Amino acid sequence: KYLFPKINETLLIDIALGNRFNWLAKEQDYSEEYVIMDTVPINMDLS
Amino acid sequence: KYLFPKINETLLIDIALGNRFNWLAKEQDFIGQYSEEYVIMDTVPINMDLS
């Protein structure tokens, strides 16, 4: 009835976690970009 | 606030203790139950009177 209670193991259950998107990893150091509007060809009415 | 109290060691201090009389330790063989000893009383002489 007089001993201190003897602890013996802690563990820290731990797992890492993921992304499922890390093949989009683009590094760098407003930003914009652009595209061309279509120009369909034409009837050569040479008159 | 959520961990068990870890103790690290215990000691058990203990020292053996003597008797200071072990040169008196005579040894029997554990047979019989009575021992006995006896001396003779002293008896001084007398003057011898021939009457």
XYZ file of all heavy atoms in Angstrom:
814
model
N 0.800 -1.209 0.000
C 0.000 0.000 0.000
C 0.837 1.265 0.000
O 0.305 2.338 0.286
C -0.920 0.012 1.218
C -1.883 -1.145 1.277
C -2.927 -1.043 0.195
C -3.987 -2.112 0.371
N -3.443 -3.463 0.065
N 2.127 1.178 -0.296
C 3.001 2.317 -0.103
C 3.888 2.633 -1.286
O 4.539 3.682 -1.275
C 3.884 2.099 1.128
C 3.088 2.065 2.394
C 2.637 0.864 2.916
C 2.752 3.238 3.053
C 1.894 0.826 4.067
C 2.013 3.209 4.211
C 1.585 1.999 4.712
O 0.843 1.962 5.865
N 3.939 1.783 -2.296
C 4.816 2.042 -3.418
C 4.215 3.080 -4.350
O 2.997 3.234 -4.452
C 5.092 0.758 -4.187
C 5.917 -0.244 -3.393
C 6.018 -1.548 -4.151
C 7.289 0.332 -3.125
N 5.092 3.807 -5.013
C 4.666 4.681 -6.082
C 4.248 3.833 -7.278
O 4.862 2.796 -7.537
C 5.807 5.613 -6.461
C 5.441 6.639 -7.471
C 4.697 7.745 -7.108
C 5.853 6.509 -8.781
C 4.358 8.698 -8.039
C 5.524 7.460 -9.716
C 4.772 8.557 -9.344
N 3.191 4.220 -7.995
C 2.725 3.411 -9.131
C 3.731 3.405 -10.270
O 4.134 4.457 -10.764
C 1.424 4.101 -9.542
C 0.982 4.797 -8.331
C 2.216 5.257 -7.639
N 4.124 2.212 -10.688
C 5.224 2.035 -11.622
C 4.699 2.053 -13.049
O 4.007 1.122 -13.473
C 5.961 0.729 -11.336
C 6.518 0.670 -9.936
C 7.588 1.722 -9.752
C 8.171 1.661 -8.361
N 7.170 2.126 -7.362
N 5.022 3.114 -13.778
C 4.748 3.162 -15.207
C 5.912 2.519 -15.956
O 7.039 2.441 -15.457
C 4.511 4.618 -15.654
C 3.752 4.686 -16.972
C 5.802 5.398 -15.760
C 2.349 4.299 -16.825
N 5.632 1.981 -17.143
C 6.726 1.361 -17.885
C 6.782 1.652 -19.380
O 7.885 1.617 -19.934
C 6.702 -0.151 -17.665
C 5.345 -0.745 -17.908
O 4.423 -0.055 -18.332
N 5.207 -2.039 -17.631
N 5.678 1.951 -20.065
C 5.759 2.210 -21.501
C 4.843 3.348 -21.911
O 3.649 3.338 -21.604
C 5.408 0.977 -22.351
C 6.423 -0.161 -22.303
C 6.030 -1.227 -21.325
O 4.853 -1.208 -20.908
O 6.869 -2.072 -20.944
N 5.417 4.310 -22.620
C 4.698 5.215 -23.498
C 5.118 4.872 -24.915
O 6.173 4.269 -25.123
C 5.037 6.670 -23.202
O 6.406 6.906 -23.546
C 4.873 6.945 -21.737
N 4.308 5.245 -25.893
C 4.817 4.893 -27.213
C 4.833 6.044 -28.207
O 5.763 6.094 -29.014
C 4.025 3.700 -27.781
C 4.483 2.932 -29.032
C 4.018 3.534 -30.362
C 6.000 2.787 -29.020
N 3.841 6.945 -28.173
C 3.561 7.899 -29.251
C 3.304 7.157 -30.557
O 4.209 7.008 -31.386
C 4.647 8.971 -29.424
C 4.386 10.059 -30.469
C 3.073 10.765 -30.224
C 5.520 11.047 -30.466
N 2.133 6.533 -30.655
C 1.563 6.157 -31.944
C 1.601 7.361 -32.873
O 1.065 8.423 -32.546
C 0.126 5.625 -31.785
C 0.116 4.224 -31.170
C -0.610 5.620 -33.104
C 0.737 3.144 -32.042
N 2.261 7.216 -34.020
C 2.324 8.296 -34.994
C 2.526 7.738 -36.390
O 3.355 6.848 -36.600
C 3.450 9.279 -34.679
C 3.508 10.420 -35.673
O 2.658 11.326 -35.596
O 4.394 10.401 -36.549
N 1.772 8.276 -37.337
C 1.933 7.971 -38.748
C 1.991 9.282 -39.510
O 1.401 10.284 -39.098
C 0.796 7.061 -39.264
C -0.580 7.574 -38.814
C 1.020 5.623 -38.826
C -1.318 8.451 -39.808
N 2.702 9.272 -40.626
C 2.710 10.435 -41.496
C 1.488 10.404 -42.406
O 0.738 9.429 -42.442
C 3.995 10.482 -42.319
N 1.283 11.496 -43.141
C 0.153 11.608 -44.051
C 0.646 12.047 -45.421
O 1.801 12.440 -45.589
C -0.906 12.595 -43.550
C -1.917 12.151 -42.492
C -2.592 10.874 -42.918
C -1.332 12.020 -41.097
N -0.245 11.975 -46.411
C 0.114 12.206 -47.783
C -0.643 13.349 -48.429
O -1.312 14.152 -47.767
N -0.537 13.416 -49.744
C -1.072 14.490 -50.566
C -2.124 14.014 -51.549
O -3.155 14.660 -51.673
C 0.087 15.153 -51.334
C -0.308 16.433 -52.076
O -1.456 16.868 -52.080
N 0.680 17.058 -52.698
N -1.845 12.922 -52.270
C -2.465 12.415 -53.502
C -2.452 13.443 -54.635
O -3.116 13.246 -55.656
C -3.892 11.856 -53.271
C -5.104 12.801 -53.202
C -6.430 12.083 -53.036
N -6.530 11.357 -51.778
C -6.579 10.035 -51.692
N -6.546 9.302 -52.794
N -6.671 9.446 -50.509
N -1.646 14.502 -54.512
C -1.508 15.484 -55.580
C -0.079 15.959 -55.749
O 0.145 17.053 -56.277
C -2.380 16.693 -55.334
C -3.829 16.406 -55.440
C -4.627 16.391 -54.315
C -4.404 16.170 -56.671
C -5.981 16.143 -54.411
C -5.759 15.919 -56.780
C -6.545 15.907 -55.646
N 0.898 15.174 -55.327
C 2.246 15.701 -55.321
C 2.937 15.569 -56.666
O 4.080 16.011 -56.793
C 3.065 15.014 -54.240
C 4.076 15.938 -53.608
O 4.652 15.631 -52.570
N 4.268 17.096 -54.212
N 2.282 15.005 -57.673
C 2.826 15.143 -59.014
C 2.400 16.443 -59.675
O 2.590 16.593 -60.883
C 2.429 13.959 -59.893
C 0.978 13.798 -60.048
C 0.186 14.390 -60.976
C 0.132 12.963 -59.267
N -1.113 13.999 -60.806
C -1.171 13.113 -59.765
C 0.349 12.103 -58.191
C -2.254 12.435 -59.225
C -0.727 11.430 -57.654
C -2.012 11.597 -58.172
N 1.802 17.361 -58.928
C 1.588 18.717 -59.392
C 2.570 19.690 -58.782
O 2.357 20.903 -58.857
C 0.171 19.182 -59.083
C -0.903 18.826 -60.104
C -0.457 19.268 -61.488
C -1.317 17.377 -60.087
N 3.643 19.180 -58.186
C 4.605 19.985 -57.445
C 5.353 20.892 -58.409
O 6.262 20.459 -59.117
C 5.573 19.086 -56.691
N 4.957 22.157 -58.441
C 5.629 23.173 -59.226
C 6.167 24.240 -58.288
O 5.413 24.847 -57.523
C 4.692 23.799 -60.260
C 4.791 23.177 -61.648
C 4.304 21.736 -61.676
C 4.701 21.032 -62.967
N 4.157 21.700 -64.183
N 7.478 24.436 -58.323
C 8.155 25.409 -57.484
C 8.384 26.685 -58.276
O 8.239 26.698 -59.499
C 9.482 24.852 -56.973
C 10.515 24.599 -58.060
C 10.406 23.214 -58.688
O 9.371 22.537 -58.506
O 11.363 22.802 -59.374
N 8.749 27.756 -57.580
C 8.870 29.068 -58.194
C 9.854 29.883 -57.360
O 10.517 29.349 -56.462
C 7.462 29.680 -58.329
C 7.255 30.799 -59.349
C 7.098 32.148 -58.693
O 6.510 32.248 -57.622
N 7.618 33.191 -59.325
N 10.001 31.171 -57.663
C 10.882 32.034 -56.887
C 10.145 33.052 -56.033
O 10.811 33.788 -55.284
C 11.858 32.770 -57.810
C 11.157 33.580 -58.887
O 9.933 33.427 -59.053
O 11.830 34.389 -59.560
N 0.827 39.406 -59.696
C -0.132 38.828 -60.623
C 0.601 38.043 -61.702
O 1.718 38.399 -62.090
C -1.004 39.920 -61.253
C -1.976 40.589 -60.296
C -2.615 41.773 -60.638
C -2.263 40.032 -59.057
C -3.503 42.383 -59.771
C -3.146 40.634 -58.184
C -3.762 41.806 -58.546
O -4.641 42.401 -57.675
N -0.025 36.967 -62.175
C 0.508 36.152 -63.257
C -0.623 35.802 -64.206
O -1.747 35.554 -63.782
C 1.145 34.867 -62.738
O 0.166 34.025 -62.163
N -0.332 35.770 -65.498
C -1.395 35.532 -66.456
C -0.836 34.864 -67.693
O 0.369 34.837 -67.918
C -2.114 36.837 -66.804
C -1.280 37.920 -67.439
C -1.357 37.885 -68.943
O -2.254 37.193 -69.464
O -0.552 38.575 -69.600
N -1.735 34.314 -68.501
C -1.341 33.748 -69.777
C -2.518 33.818 -70.729
O -3.644 34.141 -70.339
C -0.831 32.315 -69.634
C -1.775 31.358 -68.944
C -2.726 30.676 -69.898
O -2.468 30.704 -71.122
O -3.727 30.111 -69.420
N -2.247 33.447 -71.971
C -3.061 33.892 -73.082
C -3.059 32.837 -74.169
O -2.279 31.884 -74.147
C -2.549 35.230 -73.617
C -1.177 35.161 -74.249
C -1.029 35.159 -75.624
C -0.031 35.167 -73.470
C 0.220 35.134 -76.205
C 1.215 35.121 -74.039
C 1.337 35.103 -75.400
O 2.589 35.065 -75.965
N -3.936 33.044 -75.144
C -4.147 32.103 -76.227
C -4.687 32.900 -77.402
O -5.135 34.037 -77.249
C -5.113 30.980 -75.785
C -6.555 31.457 -75.791
C -4.921 29.713 -76.605
N -4.616 32.322 -78.566
C -4.974 33.000 -79.805
C -6.395 32.630 -80.192
O -6.791 31.474 -80.081
C -3.979 32.598 -80.910
C -2.537 32.817 -80.422
C -4.203 33.374 -82.178
C -2.236 34.248 -80.082
N -7.160 33.584 -80.700
C -8.474 33.274 -81.242
C -8.356 32.827 -82.696
O -7.498 33.308 -83.439
C -9.391 34.487 -81.137
C -9.532 34.997 -79.728
S -10.074 33.688 -78.631
C -11.699 33.366 -79.301
N -9.205 31.874 -83.084
C -9.111 31.236 -84.393
C -9.425 32.209 -85.522
O -10.238 33.125 -85.375
C -10.069 30.052 -84.496
C -9.639 28.872 -83.662
O -8.428 28.703 -83.458
O -10.511 28.091 -83.229
N -8.759 32.004 -86.657
C -8.998 32.783 -87.876
C -9.205 31.795 -89.020
O -8.232 31.306 -89.598
C -7.837 33.723 -88.181
O -6.628 32.967 -88.308
C -7.669 34.776 -87.094
N -10.459 31.525 -89.359
C -10.779 30.529 -90.379
C -10.379 31.061 -91.751
O -10.395 32.279 -91.970
C -12.267 30.137 -90.332
C -12.589 29.493 -89.003
C -13.161 31.334 -90.565
N -9.980 30.196 -92.686
C -9.557 30.664 -94.010
C -10.686 31.221 -94.847
O -11.841 31.261 -94.414
C -8.973 29.405 -94.651
C -8.591 28.581 -93.525
C -9.598 28.797 -92.467
N -10.374 31.639 -96.059
C -11.237 32.565 -96.761
C -11.344 32.139 -98.215
O -10.525 31.368 -98.718
C -10.685 33.995 -96.608
C -11.779 35.033 -96.651
C -9.699 34.329 -97.699
C -11.279 36.325 -96.108
N -12.379 32.620 -98.885
C -12.577 32.323 -100.291
C -11.807 33.345 -101.112
O -12.052 34.548 -100.998
C -14.068 32.360 -100.619
C -14.392 31.740 -101.959
O -13.505 31.283 -102.678
N -15.678 31.712 -102.299
N -10.871 32.884 -101.932
C -10.083 33.824 -102.721
C -10.899 34.246 -103.930
O -10.787 33.666 -105.010
C -8.751 33.216 -103.139
C -7.813 34.215 -103.793
S -6.204 33.536 -104.211
C -5.422 34.977 -104.927
N -11.745 35.251 -103.750
C -12.497 35.841 -104.850
C -11.608 36.959 -105.383
O -11.693 38.104 -104.936
C -13.860 36.345 -104.385
C -14.839 36.533 -105.529
O -14.475 36.239 -106.688
O -15.975 36.977 -105.265
N -10.749 36.619 -106.338
C -9.664 37.486 -106.780
C -10.118 38.621 -107.683
O -9.272 39.346 -108.213
C -8.590 36.665 -107.497
C -8.790 36.154 -108.925
C -7.437 35.793 -109.488
C -9.714 34.947 -109.008
N -11.423 38.806 -107.862
C -11.939 39.901 -108.665
C -11.751 41.258 -108.008
O -11.880 42.276 -108.691
C -13.422 39.677 -108.945
O -14.171 39.734 -107.743
N -1.317 17.159 -19.833
C -2.274 16.719 -18.836
C -2.721 15.286 -19.045
O -3.509 14.779 -18.244
C -3.488 17.639 -18.855
C -3.144 19.094 -18.630
C -2.636 19.326 -17.225
C -2.469 20.807 -16.955
N -1.330 21.375 -17.727
N -2.233 14.616 -20.084
C -2.818 13.360 -20.522
C -1.832 12.207 -20.540
O -2.040 11.246 -21.284
C -3.418 13.532 -21.915
C -4.585 14.477 -21.955
C -4.404 15.812 -22.279
C -5.866 14.040 -21.654
C -5.465 16.683 -22.313
C -6.935 14.903 -21.688
C -6.727 16.224 -22.016
O -7.790 17.092 -22.048
N -0.766 12.265 -19.756
C 0.237 11.214 -19.776
C 0.399 10.593 -18.401
O 0.166 11.232 -17.373
C 1.587 11.732 -20.260
C 1.823 11.790 -21.768
C 1.100 12.947 -22.431
C 3.309 11.871 -22.038
N 0.809 9.365 -18.398
C 0.993 8.627 -17.166
C 2.280 9.081 -16.487
O 3.268 9.369 -17.165
C 1.047 7.137 -17.468
C 1.076 6.268 -16.258
C -0.076 6.048 -15.521
C 2.247 5.645 -15.869
C -0.053 5.242 -14.409
C 2.277 4.834 -14.758
C 1.124 4.632 -14.027
N 2.293 9.180 -15.159
C 3.501 9.623 -14.443
C 4.601 8.578 -14.522
O 4.465 7.478 -13.991
C 3.008 9.804 -13.007
C 1.555 9.970 -13.137
C 1.129 9.130 -14.266
N 5.698 8.935 -15.170
C 6.817 8.029 -15.366
C 7.731 8.103 -14.156
O 8.285 9.167 -13.863
C 7.600 8.399 -16.623
C 6.778 8.441 -17.876
C 6.303 7.068 -18.251
C 5.597 7.118 -19.581
N 4.323 7.871 -19.451
N 7.896 6.994 -13.464
C 8.959 6.902 -12.476
C 10.181 6.355 -13.187
O 10.075 5.683 -14.216
C 8.576 6.056 -11.240
C 8.260 4.598 -11.590
C 7.413 6.684 -10.506
C 9.397 3.611 -11.315
N 11.346 6.631 -12.636
C 12.586 6.280 -13.308
C 13.373 5.167 -12.635
O 13.919 4.318 -13.341
C 13.454 7.529 -13.456
C 13.564 8.305 -12.177
O 13.114 7.858 -11.121
N 14.158 9.487 -12.257
N 13.443 5.135 -11.307
C 14.038 3.988 -10.640
C 13.507 3.855 -9.230
O 12.841 4.747 -8.699
C 15.563 4.069 -10.561
C 16.047 5.113 -9.594
C 16.307 6.428 -10.258
O 15.961 6.564 -11.450
O 16.859 7.337 -9.603
N 13.820 2.713 -8.637
C 13.678 2.487 -7.213
C 14.987 1.902 -6.709
O 15.847 1.508 -7.500
C 12.518 1.565 -6.908
O 12.261 1.604 -5.504
C 12.832 0.142 -7.325
N 15.157 1.866 -5.394
C 16.492 1.635 -4.865
C 16.659 0.389 -4.018
O 17.634 -0.328 -4.246
C 16.956 2.848 -4.058
C 17.181 4.059 -4.957
C 17.525 5.288 -4.152
C 18.272 3.759 -5.964
N 15.769 0.125 -3.052
C 15.890 -0.981 -2.091
C 17.215 -0.882 -1.327
O 18.186 -1.577 -1.610
C 15.728 -2.360 -2.754
C 15.498 -3.633 -1.914
C 14.696 -4.593 -2.725
C 16.740 -4.387 -1.454
N 17.291 0.103 -0.453
C 18.479 0.189 0.379
C 18.346 -0.867 1.469
O 17.241 -1.125 1.961
C 18.681 1.618 0.917
C 17.719 2.041 2.020
C 18.455 2.603 -0.186
C 18.335 1.995 3.414
N 19.452 -1.543 1.780
C 19.429 -2.654 2.734
C 20.847 -2.944 3.185
O 21.735 -3.121 2.345
C 18.819 -3.908 2.118
C 18.415 -4.926 3.161
O 18.577 -4.638 4.364
O 17.933 -6.013 2.781
N 21.052 -3.022 4.497
C 22.343 -3.344 5.092
C 22.151 -4.510 6.051
O 21.241 -4.489 6.885
C 22.942 -2.129 5.829
C 23.099 -0.937 4.885
C 24.287 -2.476 6.423
C 24.035 -1.192 3.726
N 22.998 -5.528 5.924
C 22.975 -6.643 6.861
C 23.521 -6.214 8.216
O 24.398 -5.356 8.312
C 23.795 -7.810 6.319
N 22.993 -6.822 9.275
C 23.303 -6.414 10.637
C 23.903 -7.575 11.410
O 23.490 -8.724 11.235
C 22.057 -5.910 11.343
C 21.500 -4.676 10.651
C 20.218 -4.271 11.272
C 22.485 -3.545 10.720
N 24.877 -7.269 12.264
C 25.646 -8.278 12.960
C 25.076 -8.627 14.321
O 23.931 -8.318 14.655
N 25.911 -9.282 15.126
C 25.450 -9.909 16.357
C 26.336 -9.554 17.543
O 25.899 -9.637 18.691
C 25.440 -11.423 16.180
C 24.648 -12.143 17.242
O 23.919 -11.536 18.013
N 24.831 -13.452 17.316
N 27.604 -9.240 17.259
C 28.701 -8.962 18.209
C 28.877 -10.042 19.287
O 29.529 -9.804 20.304
C 28.598 -7.560 18.848
C 27.577 -7.297 19.945
C 27.627 -5.868 20.422
N 27.113 -4.930 19.436
C 27.151 -3.610 19.586
N 27.677 -3.088 20.683
N 26.661 -2.815 18.645
N 28.373 -11.260 19.077
C 28.607 -12.313 20.056
C 28.879 -13.664 19.417
O 28.771 -14.691 20.095
C 27.435 -12.453 21.006
C 27.295 -11.319 21.961
C 26.301 -10.379 21.795
C 28.144 -11.205 23.043
C 26.155 -9.337 22.688
C 28.003 -10.166 23.940
C 27.006 -9.232 23.760
N 29.257 -13.699 18.148
C 29.389 -14.979 17.476
C 30.649 -15.739 17.845
O 30.789 -16.890 17.427
C 29.328 -14.795 15.970
C 27.970 -14.365 15.511
O 27.800 -13.281 14.976
N 26.979 -15.209 15.743
N 31.559 -15.165 18.627
C 32.599 -16.028 19.163
C 32.142 -16.762 20.411
O 32.925 -17.520 20.986
C 33.882 -15.257 19.463
C 33.772 -14.220 20.503
C 33.930 -14.382 21.842
C 33.527 -12.837 20.291
N 33.774 -13.184 22.482
C 33.525 -12.216 21.547
C 33.301 -12.060 19.155
C 33.306 -10.856 21.703
C 33.082 -10.714 19.310
C 33.088 -10.121 20.572
N 30.909 -16.544 20.846
C 30.315 -17.376 21.876
C 29.456 -18.482 21.293
O 28.849 -19.243 22.051
C 29.465 -16.534 22.818
C 30.189 -15.705 23.878
C 31.213 -16.559 24.610
C 30.774 -14.399 23.368
N 29.394 -18.590 19.971
C 28.500 -19.535 19.328
C 29.010 -20.962 19.445
O 29.601 -21.496 18.502
C 28.316 -19.171 17.856
N 28.797 -21.591 20.591
C 29.047 -23.016 20.674
C 27.882 -23.757 20.044
O 26.775 -23.229 19.930
C 29.251 -23.458 22.121
C 30.454 -22.830 22.837
C 31.821 -23.348 22.353
C 32.546 -22.357 21.433
N 33.914 -22.814 21.064
N 28.145 -24.983 19.616
C 27.205 -25.729 18.794
C 26.896 -27.062 19.451
O 27.810 -27.829 19.762
C 27.775 -25.948 17.395
C 26.836 -26.659 16.459
C 25.648 -25.810 16.071
O 25.778 -24.569 16.063
O 24.584 -26.386 15.769
N 25.614 -27.339 19.654
C 25.221 -28.659 20.119
C 24.942 -29.601 18.967
O 25.264 -29.313 17.812
C 23.987 -28.596 21.009
C 24.278 -28.077 22.371
C 25.349 -28.890 23.051
O 26.458 -28.410 23.272
N 25.033 -30.143 23.362
N 24.351 -30.737 19.297
C 23.852 -31.677 18.317
C 22.370 -31.955 18.490
O 21.842 -32.828 17.791
C 24.652 -32.980 18.388
C 24.751 -33.522 19.797
O 24.320 -32.819 20.734
O 25.254 -34.652 19.967
N 21.699 -31.243 19.404
C 20.252 -31.285 19.624
C 19.793 -32.700 19.998
O 19.091 -33.396 19.268
C 19.515 -30.719 18.400
C 18.035 -30.611 18.573
C 17.501 -29.699 19.461
C 17.178 -31.391 17.810
C 16.142 -29.592 19.617
C 15.817 -31.293 17.962
C 15.297 -30.388 18.863
N 20.277 -33.130 21.151
C 19.794 -34.339 21.798
C 19.774 -34.061 23.291
O 20.621 -33.330 23.811
C 20.652 -35.577 21.433
C 20.073 -36.868 22.044
C 22.110 -35.368 21.789
C 20.698 -38.159 21.535
N 18.751 -34.568 23.971
C 18.601 -34.310 25.385
C 18.034 -32.935 25.642
O 17.969 -32.100 24.737
N 17.598 -32.677 26.864
C 17.072 -31.362 27.179
C 17.559 -30.790 28.490
O 17.243 -29.631 28.778
C 15.542 -31.375 27.194
C 14.954 -32.221 28.275
C 13.451 -32.135 28.301
O 12.852 -31.373 27.546
N 12.828 -32.912 29.171
N 18.293 -31.533 29.300
C 18.809 -30.978 30.536
C 20.325 -31.010 30.558
O 20.946 -32.010 30.189
C 18.260 -31.717 31.747
C 16.798 -31.488 31.930
C 15.890 -32.498 31.696
C 16.324 -30.265 32.367
C 14.547 -32.293 31.870
C 14.983 -30.045 32.542
C 14.097 -31.064 32.292
O 12.752 -30.855 32.467
N 20.910 -29.900 30.982
C 22.328 -29.832 31.270
C 22.485 -29.443 32.726
O 21.533 -29.001 33.365
C 23.039 -28.830 30.379
O 22.608 -27.519 30.677
N 23.690 -29.601 33.252
C 23.870 -29.429 34.681
C 25.326 -29.108 34.952
O 26.214 -29.609 34.265
C 23.434 -30.698 35.422
C 23.340 -30.587 36.925
C 24.651 -30.902 37.601
O 25.438 -31.668 37.012
O 24.906 -30.378 38.703
N 25.572 -28.286 35.964
C 26.941 -28.126 36.424
C 26.950 -27.903 37.924
O 25.923 -27.583 38.526
C 27.656 -26.974 35.728
C 27.199 -25.610 36.161
C 26.051 -25.086 35.337
O 25.384 -25.881 34.644
O 25.823 -23.861 35.371
N 28.133 -28.046 38.510
C 28.251 -28.121 39.954
C 29.700 -27.913 40.350
O 30.612 -28.362 39.660
C 27.741 -29.467 40.471
C 28.527 -30.662 39.996
C 29.472 -31.258 40.813
C 28.287 -31.226 38.755
C 30.169 -32.365 40.400
C 28.993 -32.323 38.324
C 29.931 -32.888 39.148
O 30.634 -33.986 38.726
N 29.902 -27.222 41.464
C 31.218 -27.072 42.059
C 31.163 -27.678 43.445
O 30.114 -28.103 43.915
C 31.666 -25.607 42.138
C 31.650 -24.989 40.781
C 30.776 -24.841 43.083
N 32.302 -27.688 44.108
C 32.385 -28.123 45.492
C 32.459 -26.884 46.366
O 33.149 -25.919 46.024
C 33.606 -29.031 45.702
C 33.594 -30.162 44.680
C 33.615 -29.606 47.096
C 32.367 -31.030 44.765
N 31.717 -26.884 47.469
C 31.847 -25.808 48.437
C 33.230 -25.825 49.061
O 33.837 -26.879 49.257
C 30.804 -25.935 49.541
C 29.430 -25.408 49.203
S 28.622 -26.325 47.890
C 28.741 -25.144 46.559
N 33.733 -24.638 49.359
C 34.977 -24.535 50.094
C 34.745 -24.927 51.542
O 33.643 -24.781 52.079
C 35.544 -23.128 50.004
C 36.074 -22.818 48.629
O 36.526 -23.760 47.946
O 36.029 -21.641 48.222
N 35.794 -25.449 52.163
C 35.712 -25.988 53.516
C 37.028 -25.737 54.228
O 37.999 -26.470 54.043
C 35.343 -27.469 53.485
O 35.694 -28.096 54.723
C 35.945 -28.176 52.286
N 37.052 -24.702 55.053
C 38.269 -24.270 55.728
C 38.654 -25.313 56.768
O 37.784 -26.042 57.263
C 38.077 -22.879 56.349
C 37.839 -21.867 55.253
C 36.897 -22.890 57.296
N 39.933 -25.461 57.085
C 40.328 -26.412 58.124
C 39.985 -25.913 59.515
O 39.441 -24.827 59.713
C 41.842 -26.519 57.947
C 42.079 -26.100 56.577
C 41.082 -25.043 56.278
N 40.326 -26.741 60.490
C 40.053 -26.457 61.884
C 41.329 -26.620 62.691
O 42.273 -27.299 62.285
C 38.929 -27.366 62.422
C 39.175 -28.833 62.052
C 37.597 -26.925 61.878
C 39.883 -29.675 63.094
N 41.345 -25.992 63.857
C 42.287 -26.383 64.889
C 41.832 -27.694 65.517
O 40.669 -27.848 65.900
C 42.429 -25.273 65.937
C 41.084 -24.690 66.397
O 40.019 -25.119 65.971
N 41.153 -23.696 67.277
N 42.736 -28.662 65.588
C 42.375 -29.971 66.119
C 42.600 -29.962 67.628
O 43.697 -29.658 68.106
C 43.133 -31.074 65.384
C 44.645 -30.985 65.353
S 45.472 -31.882 66.678
C 45.264 -33.561 66.098
N 41.532 -30.210 68.382
C 41.581 -30.195 69.837
C 41.359 -31.618 70.323
O 40.289 -32.193 70.104
C 40.534 -29.243 70.422
C 40.788 -28.912 71.889
O 41.728 -28.141 72.167
O 40.041 -29.403 72.762
N 42.361 -32.173 70.991
C 42.388 -33.587 71.327
C 41.491 -33.962 72.494
O 41.485 -35.130 72.891
C 43.821 -34.005 71.631
C 44.732 -33.965 70.416
C 46.159 -34.235 70.819
C 44.253 -35.010 69.443
N 40.731 -33.023 73.048
C 39.744 -33.345 74.066
C 38.527 -34.064 73.501
O 37.703 -34.555 74.277
C 39.295 -32.071 74.781
O 38.601 -31.213 73.893
